[PDB]
């Protein structure tokens, strides 16, 4: 789908990889296969077949996949020595912050927390109950924000990503499906976008006009690893361990002077409940920020690189390993601050409770604040979650709401 003709459609071909190369490919590897074309005789009915038309097929021996395989991706990221020279070479976090989609300026606090989405890394089996560590947030308000840009970019950089929209796929396009099998013909189940994006992030855009029953379909992932279908309607069991990158638009208007949440938006409020961070992006006129971005994005076009001579934004390739190394720590929790994390939840639930009818403030916040400070410490790789560690998370959720005060 890069060299297809200008007015054509993607084609395909079949493989018969023989010998000792079975299990030398996976769904989603831009492979490079080297073998021999051959013809094929599908013996049978002498009229449709037997027409001397040569329904060919392929043969090969060697599968050197040059894109996203054992060759170009090492560790087939944990290799410590080769990265140490650059590891001590730099010591900062925001340097890894704005290196994500670095072609505009603005929305700094969104990108870092998004980077938290790629790592995560909080896994355990405490009391038999498993805790999901995949953040799922949305994007709200779109009178021009580049909503589809972060999604389309990070779905590329994020290994094993996907992307769909409202009427770009039915419910079976998201969930499993069925098809005959050239291997056996078992009529097995093949899944949709969310069926395969587990252990990663499946991106969705313009959530509201997705579908009506689809909201239950996304209500189900909040009890993770649970994709229950009624296709055959027997069990339809499936283990999806995906995050979710939500993003949708407001209806006619953007927070009318009398309107409130669930009034200006027409999404299921129960669905709105099951998120950890809500994210609305509203841009009112700023008489001197517009010129800033105008000079920001216009330099995307005269050349092909934004950040000049102010910081050294990192290559994507080194990003790929630098994110993977942080994951393997799995620290403990500091009891010495457990006495105060609850007080932080006290001020959290109170300074929003001081008014009668502000937007909802949920009891799952204490189950959420613990899940972010861990992944944030993952990039410390230290098991040293500190008092100032959550000091960013407190302002993070602090501004996640009260986005209309001024």
């Amino acid at each position: 789908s890069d060299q297809v003709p200008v007015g054509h459609i993607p084609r395909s071909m079949t493989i018969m990889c023989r010998g000792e190369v079975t299990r030398m490919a996976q769904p989603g590897d831009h492979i490079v296969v080297s073998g021999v074309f051959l013809p094929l005789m599908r013996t049978g009915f002498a009229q449709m077949i037997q027409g001397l038309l040569s329904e060919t097929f392929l043969q090969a021996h060697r599968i050197i996949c040059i894109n996203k395989n054992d060759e170009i991706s090492d560790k087939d990221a944990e290799l410590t020595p080769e990265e140490l020279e650059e590891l001590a070479q730099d010591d900062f976090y925001e340097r890894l912050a704005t290196s994500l989609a670095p072609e505009i300026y603005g929305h700094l606090d969104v990108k870092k927390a998004l980077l938290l989405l790629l790592v995560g890394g909080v896994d355990k089996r405490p009391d038999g109950m498993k805790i999901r560590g995949n953040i799922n947030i949305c994007l709200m308000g779109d009178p021009g924000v580049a909503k589809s840009q972060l999604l389309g970019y990070i779905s590329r950089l994020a290994v094993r990503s996907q992307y769909t929209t409202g009427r770009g796929s039915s419910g079976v396009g998201l969930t499993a499906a069925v098809m005959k099998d050239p291997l056996t013909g078992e009529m097995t189940l093949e899944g949709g976008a969310l069926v395969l994006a587990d252990q990663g992030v499946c991106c969705i855009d313009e959530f509201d006009k997705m579908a009506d029953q689809d909201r239950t379909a996304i209500h189900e992932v909040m009890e993770q690893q649970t994709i229950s279908i009624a296709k055959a309607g027997i069990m339809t069991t499936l283990n999806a361990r995906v995050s979710i990158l939500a993003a949708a638009n407001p209806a006619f208007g953007r927070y009318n002077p009398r309107r409130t949440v669930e009034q200006n938006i027409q999404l299921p409020a129960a669905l709105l409940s099951r998120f950890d961070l809500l994210w609305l992006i509203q841009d009112k006129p700023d008489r001197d920020n517009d010129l800033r971005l105008a000079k920001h994005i216009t330099y995307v076009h005269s050349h092909s690189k934004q950040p000049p001579t102010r910081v050294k934004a990192l290559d994507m390739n080194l990003m790929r390993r630098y994110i993977n190394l942080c994951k393997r720590k799995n620290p403990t929790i500091p009891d010495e601050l457990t006495d105060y994390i609850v007080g932080a939840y006290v001020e959290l639930r109170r300074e929003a409770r001081n008014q009668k009818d502000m937007t909802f403030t949920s009891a799952r916040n204490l189950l959420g604040i613990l899940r972010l400070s861990t992944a944030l410490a993952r990039l410390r790789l230290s098991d040293s979650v500190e008092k100032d560690d959550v000091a960013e998370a407190l302002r993070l959720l602090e501004m996640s709401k009260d986005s209309l005060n001024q």
Partner: protein, 338 residues
Amino acid sequence: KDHIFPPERVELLQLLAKKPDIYDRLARAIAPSIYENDDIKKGILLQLFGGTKKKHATLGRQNFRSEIHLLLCGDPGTSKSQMLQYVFNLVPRSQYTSGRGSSAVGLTAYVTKDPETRQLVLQTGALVLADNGVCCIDEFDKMNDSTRSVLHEVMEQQTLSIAKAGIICQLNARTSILAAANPAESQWNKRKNIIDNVQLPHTLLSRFDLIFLVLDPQDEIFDKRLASHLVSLYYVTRHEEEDTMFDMSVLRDYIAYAREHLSPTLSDEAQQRLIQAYVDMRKVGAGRGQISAYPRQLESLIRLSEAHAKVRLSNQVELLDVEEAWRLHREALKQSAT
């Protein structure tokens, strides 16, 4: 038959039974550690101790079952869906769909084609699988109007009769309801009683036994106790057998065994108090667009009475039960004094 016990367990069972503390011990011991609003689970034990059987092999009349239904309703922050997913991991005949989980037809008559016979079939329902059991229900006020005139049939006749182009059916089904309704908002509005808030008629709202009102603890003070204790819960990752002695499974037979060998009966006890005070209890003619007391209450009251007389295993009726029954009722029957 596959659960009949030995007599040795009767020792520990009746040993638990012998103390008035049992009314509070199990109410405390349902939850893992949730130590707030224990005032309600003491009524939920009346459905866990799943009601009485005034059997009707006598004359065939009136089918007055010990029909018990009680519901909870409040904010979504309270752990209703969570508590009841745990209750799914308590009740034997656990069902769990919910408001806009499946329609009336989504609860009855899953009629469709099957490639196994490869022929069209008259087929299954959902409620009727849980005869005498429970179905935990959530988020009630999203269901279609076709449904919720189905439940009128069961709750007020305790029957079912079905007729489509295929079969006409007169099956049997009966059970006790639980559900966890929510409003169209985040919070119940003050100065707007439940008499109109949630989406139901002018007198079918109160037509359930008693809706034990629930709401977020509107108090910052309580937050620290749970934010400490129930995170240390995770942080230690095991339990402790404190004064409310959790029996690993020996508690569960006091629930199990106590459906079968009991037949609550009334001598003189749980009739006479309201039979005396009926004048001021039934001056209910006053009110502008209200709802209040009607002469059905004592049916539900005898139900709750012989229920709480089942616990303590009093084969004859309990007289103390009447007191906490009155408590149960007037705990929430003037939430609209206005």
